[PDB]
């Protein structure tokens, strides 16, 4: 009983073709986890700075 | 990190949480495990007893592949069988179709009796077993057959 999703065209307005929701959007929504994981995964692109 | 830190909260306070009398100096008790038969002896006898001395027999050139003998108890002994056929066998707990288990191919070397498998026959292949494990198996109606 996924509600539906209407598709739009490239020319704008809309179409009759429609879809379900893939049930990943029914997943929980945790900004604490997003925050931790983001801190680390954004740490992971880093070059080494250092002194002589 | 560095901003959730009691250093940052000590700033302004004089001794940085180390004291005025006691004076955080370098190595006042020694370095490392120094003084275990001396001024650190209480600690070594109260928290880490057995530290001083030798006990047994030296084994030159020891190999933890001669000593590879992982254990499996009868408690599990179906974890090795998938869930796809488990209930099939367990309800057709019968003869002439008995499930065969290669503990060795699974990663085990010995079989033990931690308890109470069902009353279904099984065929178990293994290098070693315990007396009690096997008694339980063949009481269930199964058997052991050894391998290398």
């Amino acid at each position: 009983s996924r509600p539906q999703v209407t598709v739009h065209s490239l020319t704008g307005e809309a179409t009759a073709n429609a879809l379900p929701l893939p049930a990943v959007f029914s997943a929980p929504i945790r900004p604490d986890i997003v925050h931790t994981v983001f801190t680390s995964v954004n740490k992971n692109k880093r070059q080494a700075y250092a002194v002589s | 990190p560095s901003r959730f830190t009691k250093t940052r909260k000590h700033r302004g306070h004089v001794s940085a949480g180390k004291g005025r009398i006691g004076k955080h100096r370098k190595h006042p008790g020694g370095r490392g495990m120094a003084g275990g038969q001396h001024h650190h002896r209480i600690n070594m006898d109260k928290y880490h007893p057995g530290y001083f001395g030798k006990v047994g027999m030296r084994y030159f050139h020891k190999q933890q592949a001669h000593f590879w003998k992982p254990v499996l108890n009868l408690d599990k002994l179906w974890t090795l069988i998938p869930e796809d056929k488990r209930d099939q066998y367990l309800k057709s707990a019968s003869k002439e179709t008995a499930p065969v288990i290669d503990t060795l191919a699974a990663g085990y070397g010995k079989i033990l009796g931690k308890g109470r498998i069902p009353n279904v026959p099984v065929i178990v292949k293994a290098r070693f077993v315990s007396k009690l494990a096997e008694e339980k198996i063949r009481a269930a109606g199964g058997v052991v057959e050894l391998i290398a």
Partner: protein, 185 residues
């Protein structure tokens, strides 16, 4: 002045409003504290505290443990409640049909229960079915099964598991541990 017979401005020593920043857990806490405040129910208050509890004061509960509980008398058609997580245990082969309510369910345990014909339930569904703890049964898991509780309280003549990385011969099986090398503890 005052000659105090106590300590002043001391905290209760009891956790309110956990420091888990999990918003769904906080929703559950809002719910169950409403219910504790109004439904005059010790079960609601118990659940509220157990929701405040930490990871290790929230151990897991094995379905085999649940099965022992349902093997009690008068407790078969009851509703089990676990504030924590429920783990599978393939050391058993049968299982009854009951319903279980809890925060988390290992996929294996969920499968086991569903296969036995029950339903795995959240605490909000529980709050709509049995607000005052109608026909429930709370379970808590072991706490002293922990490999830090081995070392807790380490001294002579306690039998209490030193803190040690490597095991075997010549790692603390000597002086202090036998009467040949001086003394046994």
């Amino acid at each position: 002045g005052i000659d105090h017979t106590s300590k002043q401005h001391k905290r209760s020593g009891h956790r309110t409003a956990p420091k888990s920043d999990n918003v769904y857990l906080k929703l559950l806490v809002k719910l169950y504290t409403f219910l504790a405040r109004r439904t005059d129910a010790p079960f609601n208050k118990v659940v509220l505290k157990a929701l405040f509890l930490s990871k290790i004061n929230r151990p897991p509960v094995s379905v085999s443990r649940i099965a022992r509980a349902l093997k009690q008398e008068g407790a078969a058609n009851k509703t089990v409640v676990v504030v924590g997580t429920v783990t599978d245990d393939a050391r058993i082969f049968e299982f009854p049909k009951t319903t279980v309510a809890a925060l988390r369910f290992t996929a294996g345990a969920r499968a086991k229960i569903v296969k036995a014909g029950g339903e795995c339930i959240t605490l909000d569904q529980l709050a709509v079915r049995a607000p005052k703890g109608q026909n429930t049964l709370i379970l808590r898991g072991p706490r002293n099964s922990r490999e830090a509780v081995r070392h807790f309280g380490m001294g002579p003549h306690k039998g209490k598991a030193p803190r040690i990385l490597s095991t075997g011969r010549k790692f603390e099986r000597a002086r202090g541990r036998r009467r040949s090398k001086g003394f046994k503890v």
